[PDB]
Amino acid sequence: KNEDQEMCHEFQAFMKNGKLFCPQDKKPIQSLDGIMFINKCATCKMILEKEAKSQ
Structure with a gap:
C-alpha cells in the first residue's frame, strides 16, 4: 500500500x-x-526503480 x-x-x-x-x-x-525488515531492501529497491521510469 502507499504506507x-x-x-x-x-x-x-x-x-x-x-x-x-x-x-x-x-x-x-x-x-x-x-x-x-529485509523487505525494505526488496520493496524499496523496486520502489526506488519506479522513480527512474520518470527519467
Whole structure:
C-alpha cells in the first residue's frame, strides 16, 4: 500500500548508483511482503526503480 512506500523513504536515501544500500537498522520492522525488515531492501529497491521510469 502507499504506507509501504514510506519504508522505502529511509531506504531511498541509502540508495546509490541505482542500488539500495539497506543498512542494518537496530529496530526491526515487520514487512508485509512476507519478509522481516529485509523487505525494505526488496520493496524499496523496486520502489526506488519506479522513480527512474520518470527519467
